[PDB]
Amino acid sequence: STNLKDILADLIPKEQARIKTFRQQHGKTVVGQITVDMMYGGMRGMKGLVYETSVLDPDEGIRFRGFSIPECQKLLPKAKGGEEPLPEGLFWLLVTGHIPTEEQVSWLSKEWAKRAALPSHVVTMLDNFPTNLHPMSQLSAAVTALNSESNFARAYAQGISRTKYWELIYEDSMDLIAKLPCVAAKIYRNLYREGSGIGAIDSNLDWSHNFTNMLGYTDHQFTELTRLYLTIHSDHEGGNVSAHTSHLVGSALSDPYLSFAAAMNGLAGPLHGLANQEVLVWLTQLQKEVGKDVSDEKLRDYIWNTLNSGRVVPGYGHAVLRKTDPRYTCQREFALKHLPNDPMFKLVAQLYKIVPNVLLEQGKAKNPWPNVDAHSGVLLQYYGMTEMNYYTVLFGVSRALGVLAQLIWSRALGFPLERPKSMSTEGLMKFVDS
């Protein structure tokens, strides 16, 4: 059927019954050890939470409810006259575990169009932000202010059953996804197009297309790039700072608006949300140093000199994943068919030819292949989206789809408050003796 809520309602008791019998048997089964180093080291390598929407497969990349990225590219529905997978369909996949039909994606598109509205106090707030305020701060602050439209918040205050929490979490999550393009386009134009207006929603367009229209972009291939981008950056397990922050805040029964905004303050941190920008800065510098006509030998020399100097090539290397990131590969294929003669893409492609063979030869990088962030900037830049501070806002709007799909499930399955135990240094030294 074309009602995502009905399907979701049917799947929940079944997953509840699967988890109930699993924990009965294996609840006290041990899955790991905690060390002193793990406590000092940011829980590195500690299995700490259940996050159902995605899992990293060391041989194939990130999987979306079992489906690899190549599989999602082929199976997820497209726009009419398009060939890139729609985010609507990714969202359906993460909530249900099932690839949706054309009829389901179209319905979801219409639903997000229906729900897309901003109250006048958020509009006013956004127009009064200074140029001085970072776009990620604008995004978080405006989403926090939209919790005045949270119906989970208001219903909880009146009293509702634990077993029904997921219902209004789903409703609030759908409304938030619907509004994100409006909030994000508003920020873009207030900062980078002199306060010009974002125009109106067209209810017959998909999410991505309404977003590029609101941004003021016109090129069909930019809209196609945005569909791909938003689908592939949508989720990457629960351990990363943006996912875990939404999870943790969500666990206190804070509504989707509050949870997502907290997540964006995490994504804004330079150790989580700047990888795209860092690669692009480094490519731009490289191009200046070495020139646009560079020989395979001269680039190899520069890479070798970089590594011998003890610096790293940004966007390359991984401890776990054993092949090139499919999300990188998706963007490479886009580039080859739509901007194969762009000079910055040629540099990116030349790096793909040369760097990994150098890295295998040095023999240090556990796996010498590039990730998604090595390829994303040159594509945005090609279509005139050159405001690098804004890149993390796009990642955010994408990542909403994954974190909110999980959040619905967390509440459906009754996941409790996240409350690990902390220790001081002095305390942990005493605990060591026992």
Added chain:
Amino acid sequence: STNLKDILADLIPKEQARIKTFRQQHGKTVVGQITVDMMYGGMRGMKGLVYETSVLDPDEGIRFRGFSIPECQKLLPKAKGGEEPLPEGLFWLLVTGHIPTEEQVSWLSKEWAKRAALPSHVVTMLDNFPTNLHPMSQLSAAVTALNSESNFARAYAQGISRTKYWELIYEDSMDLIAKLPCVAAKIYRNLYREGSGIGAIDSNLDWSHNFTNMLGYTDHQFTELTRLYLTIHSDHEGGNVSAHTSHLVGSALSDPYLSFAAAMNGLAGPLHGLANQEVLVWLTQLQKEVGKDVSDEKLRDYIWNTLNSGRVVPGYGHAVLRKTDPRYTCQREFALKHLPNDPMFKLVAQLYKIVPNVLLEQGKAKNPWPNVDAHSGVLLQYYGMTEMNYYTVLFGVSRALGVLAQLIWSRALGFPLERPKSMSTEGLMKFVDS
């Protein structure tokens, strides 16, 4: 000396050297097991992080760098003509591990006065928020907007040494603590005093007194209640949602403004920030049901009936702490000397007489004593602070002191990104076989 930064700079390399040798020896020492139930159960009972500023002692209550609450009441400096401990002094204690002198508290008071300023865009934003927007949302959104004044953010973007991060984290944290009363009083008056102004900072007053003036309160004993309140709600280990959220977001190198605002979205959740309000609602109902002249027997009957009905007495019970919460006791003593004939306090006191003996007799509650949240509402209500939505904003302003004391230390000690490992249900079932 009277420079907190200098003292802090002297202590850091010493704690670094203590941690270095500790992890050399005991780094691979195991401190616990992780079970499947712990993953499904919000990391309950998993030792997961190092948080230096406070530790829960099962026999004495929460300790602030080793000092119990009774010790902090006697040793922390007071205002002239006061007898309640100043928050300034608590902050000094958490940063240094040392009880400050009078000269140090006074200096800290002057520093927070010096730094207390709002830019015009935050003022405008606060005045344009609707009545419809919850005060906790107002607080978080305005603090996120103040990251435009973060000097850690701007310095990081230009490039600074890992070893110097704590310096600007300290600066930004001091500025944020300084501004919180302005932001919080602004919210109070815009919501509950028809938009009237908060007036100016007096540089010769302490933090609490400037806050009550800005709120529009006049009673000396209210200012004294606020000093006590802000000192005792300041920190309670790292495991709670507000602390852990600041810690986690902080770990991505997000600045103190972004970290604290994310923390407030966590505190806003009903499972973390509503305990005060819930007790007060329940006391008000109780008073109606049973009357103001209630006999010890009639109240005992109502408590017994409540428990036999299988409901709980809010603000009573604890799995770990084996005596009455000192933070409760602090408020009881305040009440006995300043509002001993208040009818709601008499009810609170009558409950203290009767409930715990009933709970020991039922023999279920591991420990039958009350916590801080059982006593805080009746005191706020007595002085005319009756806007219960606002109670969580006060808790927030207090909790800033503890979470930001830790955050400075996290960066001084080079704590890395918090990144536990997540698993799907399906994945965790497969991992079980191995």
